[PDB]
């Protein structure tokens, strides 16, 4: 487990708020990139917001992206969306979480 | 309750008396750990209302002590704010978020 | 030797499961079960 990462985010995303999401990576010695992204749930069909961030010794392998769910881009309907995916993609790793 | 017995203690005194706007807050944080060779820095996030408003990194001095949290308490903090501090450290193969 | 375009993949963590020292994950019901429930060198049995 010599290479590791943390992404940290609000407990609840507020729809229509400019949520700021930090990334930190560890054990890396050549620069790379990541795309912290907010996607529809379950289906991952619609990217609601995405940010692209550079990780390097010059940034001390830390960055943040500012991401939002625009209120009108949600599918709406009779009972409203209660969950969304936060995803990261990068060389070396990807994961997502509800 | 760290499984790795690796800790991060914020030296601050939690005070009910307020910090004044724009003043330099100066907090010490001590990462006591079996693995202090590997904790080259800790990282911090300042949270105001719901949002991570500031973030950064705090490096190891040669005396085996660290950059304090030296931040102006900027206007986005004013009702109250919350500091969180973290690091990941490695054993021989394992890792823990502290 | 070569400079890779594709990067080296990471582990993923055991999350709520107990991490055994190998990197395998087992249920927290098996920690201090009294059986060596991690394969190879048990860790689930440590200091109970």
């Amino acid at each position: 487990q010599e290479q590791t990462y943390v992404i940290s985010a609000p407990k609840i995303f507020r729809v229509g708020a400019s949520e700021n999401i930090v990334i930190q990576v560890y054990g890396y010695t050549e620069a790379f990139d990541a795309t912290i992204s907010i996607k529809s749930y379950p289906d991952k069909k619609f990217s609601y917001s995405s940010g692209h961030v550079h990780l390097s010794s010059e940034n001390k392998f830390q960055n943040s992206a500012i991401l939002t769910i625009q209120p009108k881009q949600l599918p709406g309907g009779q009972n409203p969306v209660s969950y969304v995916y936060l995803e990261v993609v990068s060389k070396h790793f990807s994961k997502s979480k509800r | 309750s760290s499984l790795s017995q690796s800790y991060l203690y914020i030296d601050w005194t939690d005070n009910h008396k307020a910090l004044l706007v724009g003043e330099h807050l100066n907090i010490i944080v001590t990462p006591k750990s079996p693995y202090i060779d590997k904790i080259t820095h800790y990282n911090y996030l300042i949270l105001s209302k719901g949002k991570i408003i500031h973030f950064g990194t705090r490096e190891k001095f040669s005396d085996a002590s660290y950059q304090s949290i030296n931040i102006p308490v900027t206007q986005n903090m004013v009702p109250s704010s919350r500091l969180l501090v973290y690091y990941i450290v490695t054993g021989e193969q394992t890792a823990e978020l502290v | 030797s070569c400079e890779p375009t594709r990067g080296c993949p990471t582990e993923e963590g055991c999350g709520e499961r107990f991490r055994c020292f190998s990197g395998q994950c087992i249920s927290k019901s098996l920690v201090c079960n009294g059986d060596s429930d991690c394969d190879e060198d048990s860790a689930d049995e440590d200091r109970c």
Partner: peptide
């Protein structure tokens, strides 16, 4: 948070909190 370093706050769930400041 999302991390590979062996934790997930998915093991925790809220209470109607009342600790005061």
């Amino acid at each position: 948070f999302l991390t590979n370093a062996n934790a997930d706050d998915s093991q925790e769930n809220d209470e109607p909190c009342k600790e005061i400041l």
